[PDB]
Chain A
Amino acid sequence: WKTAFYAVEKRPMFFEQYEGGSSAWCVKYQFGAEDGGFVGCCEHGRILQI
């Protein structure tokens, strides 16, 4: 796994109040995150199946 598949990370999750859209009744929060992954050389690695 240390060479068959990689997982990239840029920024962890974030939480930001959204002033605007909050119409004085329902205060609305917003969250998000960025990340990713990709398969490297997919010769190291096999799958068992029935």
Chain B
Amino acid sequence: TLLPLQTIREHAKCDDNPRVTDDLLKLYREAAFEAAELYTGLSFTPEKTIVEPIRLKGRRGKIILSATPIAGRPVVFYGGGLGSPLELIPRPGSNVL
């Protein structure tokens, strides 16, 4: 729904040559969306759930998330001297908490 195959074939002026089929053009279209959300970081990835221990950082406890959980879903913490769990809603865009 993001890129219709008619626009790319008409932008690149490549529609009458069978050397560029739909499968190879699909592998290309997947290579331009995995590098768009990775140099600029807009997360063109589907819903994933990471189980991840956090390790203390500094005297006041910097916690950097290795997968940036959404924008505001509360990540829960447990174990490691913490007798009872607690939630934490992080920064949208960044993971430094």
8 Å CB contacts to A: which residues of B78-97? 81-83
A24 proximity list for chain B (CB < 8 A): 81
The majority secondary structure among interface residues of chain A is loop
In the docked arrangement, what's the CA distance between A23 and B83, Å? 9
Chain B residue with minimal CB distance to A25? B81
How many chain B residues have a CB neighbour from A under 8 Å?
3
Q: In the complex, what residues of B have CB within 8 A of residue A21's CB? A: 83
Chain A interface size, as a band, is: under 10
- Expressed in whole angstroms, the minimum distance between the Cβ of B90 and any Cβ of chain A is 20
**Closest chain A CB from B28 CB (angstroms):** 52
**Cβ–Cβ < 8 Å partners of B83 in chain A:** 21, 23
B86 to nearest A CB, angstroms? Answer: 12
A21 (CB) vs chain B CBs: closest residue? B83
Rounded to whole angstroms, the CA-CA distance of A23 and B81 in the bound complex is 5
Taking CB as reference atom, which chain B residue is nearest A23?
Answer: B81
Chain B residues with Cβ below 8 Å from A23 are: 81-83
Q: List 7 A-B contacts (CB under 8 A).
A: A21-B83, A23-B81, A23-B82, A23-B83, A24-B81, A25-B81, A25-B82
Q: Which residues of B contact A (CB under 8 A)?
A: 81-83
Among all A-B residue pairs, the 7 with the closest Cβ atoms: A23-B81, A25-B81, A24-B81, A23-B83, A23-B82, A21-B83, A25-B82
